[PDB]
Write a structure and sequence with these properties.
Blueprint: H1 25-31
This protein binds zinc ion.
Zinc ion (ZN) binds near residues 17 and 31.
Subcellular location: Nucleus
Protein name: Zinc finger protein 224
Family: Belongs to the krueppel C2H2-type zinc-finger protein family.
């Protein structure tokens, strides 16, 4: 139940589904491919 995906790292560019860490953004944006599927055509609330 406790927090699962800890979003407390060093690098500024951190994922949202895995809160990973990366040096550049390109790596992150593209890295999001590992989470393919969820295609929200609209904005998110929380
Ligand atoms: Zn990720």
């Amino acid at each position: 139940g406790s927090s699962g995906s800890s979003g407390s790292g060093e690098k500024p560019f951190q994922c949202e589904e895995c809160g990973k860490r990366f040096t550049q953004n390109s790596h992150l944006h593209s890295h999001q491919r590992v989470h393919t599927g969820e295609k929200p055509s609209g904005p998110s609330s929380g």
